[PDB]
Tab-separated table of C-alpha atoms in Angstrom:
chain	number	residue	atom	x	y	z
A	1	UNK	CA	238.531	50.768	173.736
A	2	UNK	CA	236.853	54.125	174.270
A	3	UNK	CA	234.989	55.364	171.169
A	4	UNK	CA	236.588	58.083	169.083
A	5	UNK	CA	233.835	60.592	169.861
A	6	UNK	CA	234.371	60.588	173.644
A	7	UNK	CA	238.038	59.558	173.988
A	8	UNK	CA	238.254	61.826	177.060
A	9	UNK	CA	239.424	59.833	180.073
A	10	UNK	CA	239.368	61.027	183.672
A	11	UNK	CA	241.930	60.819	186.448
A	12	UNK	CA	239.838	58.590	188.707
A	13	UNK	CA	239.111	56.190	185.849
A	14	UNK	CA	242.789	55.900	184.920
A	15	UNK	CA	243.703	55.407	188.579
A	16	UNK	CA	241.109	52.659	189.010
A	17	UNK	CA	242.159	50.905	185.803
A	18	UNK	CA	245.926	51.046	186.431
A	19	UNK	CA	245.817	50.545	190.230
A	20	UNK	CA	247.689	53.766	191.003
A	21	UNK	CA	246.641	56.803	192.997
A	22	UNK	CA	245.301	59.871	191.214
A	23	UNK	CA	248.545	61.777	191.781
A	24	UNK	CA	250.663	59.444	189.625
A	25	UNK	CA	248.180	59.557	186.727
A	26	UNK	CA	249.806	62.726	185.396
A	27	UNK	CA	253.285	61.184	185.394
A	28	UNK	CA	252.010	57.977	183.786
A	29	UNK	CA	250.288	59.909	180.997
A	30	UNK	CA	253.356	62.107	180.486
A	31	UNK	CA	255.587	59.029	180.194
A	32	UNK	CA	253.179	57.600	177.624
A	33	UNK	CA	253.258	60.832	175.617
A	34	UNK	CA	257.051	61.089	175.833
A	35	UNK	CA	257.620	57.524	174.649
A	36	UNK	CA	255.045	58.009	171.899
A	37	UNK	CA	252.331	55.481	172.758
A	38	UNK	CA	249.499	58.034	172.869
A	39	UNK	CA	248.992	61.630	171.764
A	40	UNK	CA	246.911	64.176	173.636
A	41	UNK	CA	246.918	66.664	176.479
A	42	UNK	CA	246.375	66.890	180.231
A	43	UNK	CA	243.927	69.331	181.847
A	44	UNK	CA	244.613	69.237	185.579
A	45	UNK	CA	241.974	71.862	186.379
A	46	UNK	CA	239.189	69.604	185.097
A	47	UNK	CA	241.091	66.371	185.881
A	48	UNK	CA	240.878	64.849	182.408
A	49	UNK	CA	243.101	63.651	179.570
A	50	UNK	CA	242.137	64.225	175.930
A	51	UNK	CA	243.590	61.335	173.943
A	52	UNK	CA	243.635	62.023	170.203
A	53	UNK	CA	245.668	59.067	168.902
A	54	UNK	CA	246.666	55.658	170.254
A	55	UNK	CA	249.226	53.382	168.671
A	56	UNK	CA	247.935	50.946	166.024
A	57	UNK	CA	247.534	47.353	167.166
A	58	UNK	CA	246.914	43.962	165.587
A	59	UNK	CA	243.224	43.273	164.956
A	60	UNK	CA	241.316	40.033	164.470
A	61	UNK	CA	238.841	39.198	161.716
A	62	UNK	CA	235.781	40.415	163.634
A	63	UNK	CA	237.383	43.842	164.039
A	64	UNK	CA	238.394	43.794	160.369
A	65	UNK	CA	234.745	43.151	159.495
A	66	UNK	CA	233.748	46.062	161.714
A	67	UNK	CA	236.167	48.271	159.798
A	68	UNK	CA	234.590	46.989	156.581
A	69	UNK	CA	231.124	47.974	157.812
A	70	UNK	CA	232.362	51.447	158.730
A	71	UNK	CA	233.855	51.752	155.242
A	72	UNK	CA	230.468	50.750	153.835
A	73	UNK	CA	228.793	53.607	155.701
A	74	UNK	CA	231.479	56.056	154.558
A	75	UNK	CA	231.182	55.007	150.913
A	76	UNK	CA	227.392	55.255	151.054
A	77	UNK	CA	227.667	58.841	152.299
A	78	UNK	CA	230.182	59.693	149.566
A	79	UNK	CA	227.943	58.268	146.846
A	80	UNK	CA	224.915	60.098	148.235
A	81	UNK	CA	226.681	63.456	148.076
A	82	UNK	CA	228.061	62.761	144.597
A	83	UNK	CA	224.547	62.005	143.365
A	84	UNK	CA	223.201	65.139	145.057
A	85	UNK	CA	225.745	67.426	143.406
A	86	UNK	CA	225.352	65.797	139.994
A	87	UNK	CA	221.557	65.995	140.057
A	88	UNK	CA	221.448	69.578	141.308
A	89	UNK	CA	224.084	70.962	138.913
A	90	UNK	CA	223.302	68.888	135.802
A	91	UNK	CA	222.163	72.119	134.149
A	92	UNK	CA	225.625	73.685	134.272
A	93	UNK	CA	227.514	70.379	133.847
A	94	UNK	CA	225.922	68.146	131.208
B	1	UNK	CA	192.739	69.589	190.122
B	2	UNK	CA	193.855	72.294	187.691
B	3	UNK	CA	197.511	71.588	188.474
B	4	UNK	CA	196.854	67.953	187.566
B	5	UNK	CA	195.024	69.036	184.409
B	6	UNK	CA	198.049	71.057	183.327
B	7	UNK	CA	201.412	69.371	182.891
B	8	UNK	CA	202.917	70.664	186.137
B	9	UNK	CA	205.400	68.452	187.960
B	10	UNK	CA	203.994	69.104	191.469
B	11	UNK	CA	207.246	69.316	193.382
B	12	UNK	CA	207.347	70.597	196.974
B	13	UNK	CA	204.094	72.035	198.319
B	14	UNK	CA	203.034	74.926	196.081
B	15	UNK	CA	206.278	74.335	194.164
B	16	UNK	CA	205.858	73.328	190.509
B	17	UNK	CA	208.822	73.757	188.173
B	18	UNK	CA	207.740	75.161	184.806
B	19	UNK	CA	210.807	73.871	182.921
B	20	UNK	CA	211.209	77.217	181.169
B	21	UNK	CA	214.416	75.723	179.735
B	22	UNK	CA	212.357	74.363	176.809
B	23	UNK	CA	215.103	71.727	176.459
B	24	UNK	CA	217.503	74.626	175.741
B	25	UNK	CA	218.237	73.525	172.156
B	26	UNK	CA	222.027	73.525	171.841
B	27	UNK	CA	222.617	70.677	169.381
B	28	UNK	CA	223.771	72.005	166.010
B	29	UNK	CA	224.476	69.811	162.993
B	30	UNK	CA	225.705	72.257	160.323
B	31	UNK	CA	222.878	71.733	157.794
B	32	UNK	CA	225.074	70.843	154.836
B	33	UNK	CA	222.939	69.355	152.062
B	34	UNK	CA	220.665	72.404	152.015
B	35	UNK	CA	223.590	74.844	152.021
B	36	UNK	CA	225.236	72.909	149.189
B	37	UNK	CA	221.957	73.073	147.274
B	38	UNK	CA	221.731	76.828	147.857
B	39	UNK	CA	225.271	77.477	146.622
B	40	UNK	CA	224.698	75.222	143.610
B	41	UNK	CA	221.582	77.258	142.820
B	42	UNK	CA	223.711	80.402	143.059
B	43	UNK	CA	226.149	78.893	140.565
B	44	UNK	CA	223.317	77.819	138.266
B	45	UNK	CA	221.902	81.342	138.183
B	46	UNK	CA	225.362	82.835	137.638
B	47	UNK	CA	226.180	80.514	134.727
B	48	UNK	CA	222.870	79.887	132.944
B	49	UNK	CA	221.972	82.026	129.935
B	50	UNK	CA	219.038	84.197	130.991
C	1	UNK	CA	265.075	60.456	146.747
C	2	UNK	CA	262.769	61.804	144.039
C	3	UNK	CA	260.227	64.435	145.066
C	4	UNK	CA	258.347	64.604	141.749
C	5	UNK	CA	258.335	63.156	138.234
C	6	UNK	CA	257.244	65.287	135.268
C	7	UNK	CA	256.154	63.197	132.276
C	8	UNK	CA	255.780	65.129	129.035
C	9	UNK	CA	252.835	64.377	126.714
C	10	UNK	CA	255.138	63.168	123.938
C	11	UNK	CA	256.302	60.330	126.186
C	12	UNK	CA	252.701	59.252	126.782
C	13	UNK	CA	251.762	59.389	123.107
C	14	UNK	CA	254.913	57.462	122.174
C	15	UNK	CA	253.940	54.810	124.723
C	16	UNK	CA	250.493	54.622	123.127
C	17	UNK	CA	252.055	54.240	119.677
C	18	UNK	CA	254.354	51.463	120.907
C	19	UNK	CA	251.415	49.639	122.476
C	20	UNK	CA	249.317	49.974	119.326
C	21	UNK	CA	252.037	48.707	116.996
C	22	UNK	CA	252.998	45.731	119.166
C	23	UNK	CA	249.311	44.881	119.531
C	24	UNK	CA	248.837	45.004	115.770
C	25	UNK	CA	251.763	42.585	115.585
C	26	UNK	CA	249.815	40.466	118.069
C	27	UNK	CA	250.235	38.060	120.981
C	28	UNK	CA	251.287	40.506	123.714
C	29	UNK	CA	249.702	42.131	126.760
C	30	UNK	CA	252.277	44.537	128.228
C	31	UNK	CA	254.849	46.760	126.547
C	32	UNK	CA	258.205	47.898	127.935
C	33	UNK	CA	260.727	50.582	127.038
C	34	UNK	CA	263.179	53.206	128.248
C	35	UNK	CA	262.543	56.730	129.551
C	36	UNK	CA	265.195	59.226	128.499
C	37	UNK	CA	265.174	62.455	130.475
C	38	UNK	CA	267.000	64.857	132.782
C	39	UNK	CA	267.304	65.901	136.425
C	40	UNK	CA	266.452	69.266	138.008
C	41	UNK	CA	267.566	68.799	141.641
C	42	UNK	CA	265.036	66.208	142.809
C	43	UNK	CA	262.364	67.137	140.229
C	44	UNK	CA	262.599	64.644	137.371
C	45	UNK	CA	261.687	65.448	133.767
C	46	UNK	CA	260.853	62.637	131.338
C	47	UNK	CA	261.013	64.045	127.808
C	48	UNK	CA	261.540	61.145	125.382
C	49	UNK	CA	261.430	57.361	125.131
C	50	UNK	CA	262.084	54.512	122.719
C	51	UNK	CA	260.767	50.988	122.306
C	52	UNK	CA	262.702	47.929	123.460
C	53	UNK	CA	262.094	44.247	122.579
C	54	UNK	CA	260.453	42.451	125.495
C	55	UNK	CA	258.622	39.169	126.022
C	56	UNK	CA	257.383	37.168	128.989
C	57	UNK	CA	255.740	33.838	129.730
C	58	UNK	CA	252.149	34.341	130.864
C	59	UNK	CA	252.531	31.557	133.464
C	60	UNK	CA	256.076	31.821	134.847
C	61	UNK	CA	257.042	35.128	136.471
C	62	UNK	CA	260.707	34.237	135.934
C	63	UNK	CA	260.878	33.741	132.139
C	64	UNK	CA	261.215	37.254	130.725
C	65	UNK	CA	263.600	38.715	128.159
C	66	UNK	CA	264.737	42.296	127.522
C	67	UNK	CA	267.206	43.107	124.729
C	68	UNK	CA	269.784	45.223	126.527
C	69	UNK	CA	272.077	45.187	123.485
C	70	UNK	CA	269.315	46.869	121.485
C	71	UNK	CA	268.725	49.198	124.430
C	72	UNK	CA	272.373	50.282	124.373
C	73	UNK	CA	272.444	50.736	120.593
C	74	UNK	CA	269.264	52.816	120.481
C	75	UNK	CA	270.461	54.851	123.457
C	76	UNK	CA	273.684	55.580	121.600
C	77	UNK	CA	271.748	56.765	118.562
C	78	UNK	CA	269.386	58.885	120.667
C	79	UNK	CA	272.405	60.428	122.394
C	80	UNK	CA	273.930	61.165	118.998
C	81	UNK	CA	270.704	62.964	118.070
C	82	UNK	CA	270.162	64.791	121.401
C	83	UNK	CA	272.941	64.823	123.991
C	84	UNK	CA	271.044	66.534	126.818
C	85	UNK	CA	268.843	63.439	127.375
C	86	UNK	CA	270.174	60.492	129.383
C	87	UNK	CA	268.543	57.258	130.501
C	88	UNK	CA	266.410	57.857	133.583
C	89	UNK	CA	264.110	54.837	133.904
C	90	UNK	CA	261.794	52.398	132.179
C	91	UNK	CA	258.067	52.360	131.465
C	92	UNK	CA	255.500	49.636	130.921
C	93	UNK	CA	251.829	49.846	129.972
C	94	UNK	CA	250.733	47.001	132.236
C	95	UNK	CA	247.640	48.169	134.112
C	96	UNK	CA	249.206	47.319	137.482
C	97	UNK	CA	252.571	46.261	138.864
C	98	UNK	CA	253.758	42.803	137.831
C	99	UNK	CA	256.045	40.483	139.772
C	100	UNK	CA	258.919	40.765	137.262
C	101	UNK	CA	259.131	44.546	137.698
C	102	UNK	CA	261.780	44.451	140.431
C	103	UNK	CA	263.961	42.195	138.270
C	104	UNK	CA	263.545	44.467	135.244
C	105	UNK	CA	264.372	47.450	137.447
C	106	UNK	CA	267.511	45.716	138.697
C	107	UNK	CA	268.523	45.193	135.074
C	108	UNK	CA	267.901	48.861	134.243
C	109	UNK	CA	269.764	50.062	137.345
C	110	UNK	CA	272.987	49.125	135.546
C	111	UNK	CA	272.115	51.983	133.167
C	112	UNK	CA	270.498	54.374	135.681
C	113	UNK	CA	271.241	53.803	139.387
C	114	UNK	CA	268.198	55.873	140.420
C	115	UNK	CA	265.826	54.260	137.946
C	116	UNK	CA	262.200	55.403	138.106
C	117	UNK	CA	259.362	53.228	136.822
C	118	UNK	CA	256.350	54.869	135.175
C	119	UNK	CA	253.219	52.803	134.533
C	120	UNK	CA	251.075	54.315	131.774
C	121	UNK	CA	247.588	52.813	131.589
C	122	UNK	CA	246.690	53.095	127.903
C	123	UNK	CA	243.136	51.886	128.678
C	124	UNK	CA	242.214	53.840	131.827
C	125	UNK	CA	238.915	52.664	133.302
C	126	UNK	CA	239.010	55.275	136.053
C	127	UNK	CA	238.968	59.048	136.661
C	128	UNK	CA	242.490	60.324	137.235
C	129	UNK	CA	245.996	60.767	135.925
C	130	UNK	CA	247.391	58.068	133.595
C	131	UNK	CA	250.907	57.938	135.102
C	132	UNK	CA	252.045	56.235	138.304
C	133	UNK	CA	255.689	56.589	139.338
C	134	UNK	CA	257.545	54.050	141.479
C	135	UNK	CA	261.109	53.899	142.812
C	136	UNK	CA	262.823	50.746	144.058
C	137	UNK	CA	263.721	50.856	147.754
C	138	UNK	CA	264.928	48.433	150.407
C	139	UNK	CA	262.274	47.795	153.060
C	140	UNK	CA	263.287	46.792	156.596
C	141	UNK	CA	260.561	45.209	158.718
C	142	UNK	CA	260.075	44.298	162.369
C	143	UNK	CA	258.325	40.928	161.972
C	144	UNK	CA	258.464	40.416	158.214
C	145	UNK	CA	262.201	40.250	159.027
C	146	UNK	CA	263.918	39.592	155.636
C	147	UNK	CA	264.531	42.925	153.919
C	148	UNK	CA	262.929	42.841	150.471
C	149	UNK	CA	263.177	45.244	147.544
C	150	UNK	CA	259.800	46.973	147.252
C	151	UNK	CA	258.509	49.725	144.983
C	152	UNK	CA	257.742	53.073	146.629
C	153	UNK	CA	255.315	55.590	145.159
C	154	UNK	CA	256.504	58.971	143.891
C	155	UNK	CA	254.324	61.910	142.899
C	156	UNK	CA	253.897	62.095	139.125
C	157	UNK	CA	252.486	64.946	137.061
C	158	UNK	CA	252.198	65.983	133.420
C	159	UNK	CA	253.992	69.061	132.136
C	160	UNK	CA	254.819	70.375	128.695
C	161	UNK	CA	257.082	72.772	126.839
C	162	UNK	CA	255.652	75.484	124.576
C	163	UNK	CA	255.740	73.459	121.347
C	164	UNK	CA	254.239	70.406	123.045
C	165	UNK	CA	251.488	72.534	124.592
C	166	UNK	CA	250.705	74.141	121.232
C	167	UNK	CA	250.537	70.764	119.513
C	168	UNK	CA	248.364	69.185	122.200
C	169	UNK	CA	245.952	72.123	122.183
C	170	UNK	CA	245.730	71.965	118.392
C	171	UNK	CA	245.049	68.222	118.507
C	172	UNK	CA	242.509	68.607	121.327
C	173	UNK	CA	239.748	69.440	118.828
C	174	UNK	CA	237.950	66.304	119.977
C	175	UNK	CA	235.944	67.717	122.899
C	176	UNK	CA	236.928	71.235	123.996
C	177	UNK	CA	235.160	72.800	126.988
C	178	UNK	CA	237.194	75.380	128.906
C	179	UNK	CA	234.522	77.148	131.015
C	180	UNK	CA	237.117	78.035	133.649
C	181	UNK	CA	234.324	79.462	135.799
C	182	UNK	CA	232.138	77.758	138.366
C	183	UNK	CA	231.168	75.106	135.806
C	184	UNK	CA	234.715	73.778	135.497
C	185	UNK	CA	235.357	74.377	139.193
C	186	UNK	CA	232.376	72.054	139.747
C	187	UNK	CA	233.222	69.321	137.219
C	188	UNK	CA	237.028	69.081	137.415
C	189	UNK	CA	236.618	68.964	141.193
C	190	UNK	CA	233.749	68.176	143.558
C	191	UNK	CA	232.288	65.505	141.272
C	192	UNK	CA	235.630	64.113	140.105
C	193	UNK	CA	237.070	64.202	143.612
C	194	UNK	CA	234.084	62.426	145.137
C	195	UNK	CA	234.119	59.778	142.409
C	196	UNK	CA	237.827	59.127	142.930
C	197	UNK	CA	237.406	58.943	146.697
C	198	UNK	CA	234.581	56.454	146.209
C	199	UNK	CA	236.823	54.395	143.924
C	200	UNK	CA	239.631	54.285	146.489
C	201	UNK	CA	237.247	53.405	149.319
C	202	UNK	CA	235.716	50.664	147.166
C	203	UNK	CA	239.179	49.222	146.553
C	204	UNK	CA	239.838	49.236	150.301
C	205	UNK	CA	236.449	47.603	150.904
C	206	UNK	CA	237.180	44.868	148.372
C	207	UNK	CA	240.524	44.127	150.006
C	208	UNK	CA	238.931	44.069	153.460
C	209	UNK	CA	236.199	41.706	152.267
C	210	UNK	CA	238.826	39.386	150.800
C	211	UNK	CA	240.819	39.474	154.043
C	212	UNK	CA	237.787	38.859	156.258
C	213	UNK	CA	236.512	35.943	154.183
C	214	UNK	CA	240.011	34.460	153.939
C	215	UNK	CA	241.158	34.754	150.330
C	216	UNK	CA	244.087	36.973	151.376
C	217	UNK	CA	246.175	36.899	154.572
C	218	UNK	CA	246.281	39.714	157.097
C	219	UNK	CA	248.653	42.637	156.525
C	220	UNK	CA	249.354	44.335	159.839
C	221	UNK	CA	250.739	47.432	158.119
C	222	UNK	CA	247.581	47.904	156.042
C	223	UNK	CA	245.429	47.411	159.135
C	224	UNK	CA	247.519	49.981	161.017
C	225	UNK	CA	247.172	52.523	158.216
C	226	UNK	CA	243.413	51.960	158.174
C	227	UNK	CA	243.329	52.568	161.927
C	228	UNK	CA	245.188	55.837	161.389
C	229	UNK	CA	242.732	56.877	158.664
C	230	UNK	CA	239.678	56.158	160.804
C	231	UNK	CA	241.324	58.068	163.646
C	232	UNK	CA	241.990	61.079	161.420
C	233	UNK	CA	238.349	61.228	160.305
C	234	UNK	CA	237.243	64.440	162.080
C	235	UNK	CA	234.185	65.165	164.204
C	236	UNK	CA	231.892	67.905	162.901
C	237	UNK	CA	229.405	68.131	165.794
C	238	UNK	CA	231.761	69.969	168.157
C	239	UNK	CA	230.334	73.310	169.244
C	240	UNK	CA	233.593	75.144	168.549
C	241	UNK	CA	233.871	73.727	165.028
C	242	UNK	CA	230.220	74.507	164.291
C	243	UNK	CA	230.625	78.095	165.486
C	244	UNK	CA	233.798	78.648	163.455
C	245	UNK	CA	232.124	77.153	160.385
C	246	UNK	CA	229.147	79.479	160.743
C	247	UNK	CA	231.405	82.511	161.204
C	248	UNK	CA	233.428	81.802	158.073
C	249	UNK	CA	230.291	81.025	156.067
C	250	UNK	CA	228.772	84.340	157.151
C	251	UNK	CA	231.863	86.220	155.971
C	252	UNK	CA	231.874	84.460	152.599
C	253	UNK	CA	228.168	85.158	152.112
C	254	UNK	CA	228.732	88.826	152.980
C	255	UNK	CA	231.225	89.074	150.135
C	256	UNK	CA	228.906	87.133	147.813
C	257	UNK	CA	225.996	89.447	148.650
C	258	UNK	CA	228.070	92.550	147.932
C	259	UNK	CA	229.150	91.089	144.586
C	260	UNK	CA	225.538	90.298	143.681
C	261	UNK	CA	224.495	93.853	144.553
C	262	UNK	CA	227.204	95.222	142.255
C	263	UNK	CA	225.968	92.903	139.502
C	264	UNK	CA	222.381	94.094	139.945
C	265	UNK	CA	223.351	97.766	139.762
C	266	UNK	CA	225.358	97.132	136.587
C	267	UNK	CA	222.387	95.317	135.051
C	268	UNK	CA	220.120	98.257	135.864
C	269	UNK	CA	222.616	100.653	134.284
C	270	UNK	CA	222.640	98.559	131.118
C	271	UNK	CA	218.838	98.480	131.010
C	272	UNK	CA	218.604	102.265	131.367
C	273	UNK	CA	221.172	102.800	128.618
C	274	UNK	CA	219.399	100.376	126.283
C	275	UNK	CA	216.034	102.040	126.867
C	276	UNK	CA	217.557	105.474	126.235
C	277	UNK	CA	219.054	104.227	122.977
C	278	UNK	CA	215.816	102.623	121.795
C	279	UNK	CA	213.716	105.680	122.664
C	280	UNK	CA	216.167	107.985	120.888
C	281	UNK	CA	216.228	105.742	117.814
C	282	UNK	CA	212.427	105.625	117.675
C	283	UNK	CA	212.232	109.409	118.035
C	284	UNK	CA	214.784	109.932	115.258
C	285	UNK	CA	213.012	107.471	112.954
C	286	UNK	CA	209.690	109.206	113.620
């Protein structure tokens, strides 16, 4: 659920969501990592977990359309840069 | 009156923070289009027949 | 398991010739044939090929005919002419995989157990290599349950011997532009890479549009791979990444600046020499 740019959960949040005390959060996250559900690290000093990859899941058509929109943005950026390079270097590449 | 005229926050009595931080600009976006243009200009000057 | 397939230019040009001649004959869309070659410890080498009679019904994907007797006879003759080449796979010029391909591959596996399919697009409306290599593999699912025989991609590249390279370079007096410098390093990549990436993303977008509207059903594996891709997309606003990028750019520009200074000094030297020569020549002529 968390967006890719933050994707940095905290011990209290995990405890509240999973109905377990803050102490067991580390063991829960380590079990997840060991099994292979999520990938990341644990920073006890700052009391945070940096999740970098969660297992793929089945998505509905609304989420597929969201992925399509994101692809549209990505393709627009690619085309913009291609046009920039072509226009600026037309002199050397004709 | 002059404190009101100037943009001073008027905190505690005779205590007006000046916000010398100036927003402390830390955001950096790696200006990429302009750098690409500069390097392409370098290549153009290197390759073109003077 | 194949790690790479090397397709020599003679194979490609022979495929083109086969396609052209069958087309001149008429009433056909795809061409099929055999790929003679050799093995180099998981790095294939396709060196030669020969045509094979083949026909198919444009409606039924189960009425197709391949003359394996002719295949065997021509293979015997090719072996009599060059022993070091043995059957390695089959090729077809169809732009994309057909539904009869697994059946044809099963037929050819009785001549080459590790048969490799090579699709050669003789009319490439794209920007990329003309060869795509596939190997038949059994796929075990978790919900798709029945294990089907699917085609798995294998890296394909074009290589050549010395004679083939000489001949291709001689024939390449159509449009020759080497310019190995920054010009080619800007055209062969950058532009070509971005165009190809845009093509692939457009294909993904078309499939996603079809799925969302409802023309095609959902493929959980494709959706999972797309999730992985969008996860891999990096973030370029991190302070650490920005700082590292600036550091490396500064180093590269240091080297570039030193090179430009060397260039300028050399240019000045040339100007001084030229002026000396011209002044001396004028003095002597006077």
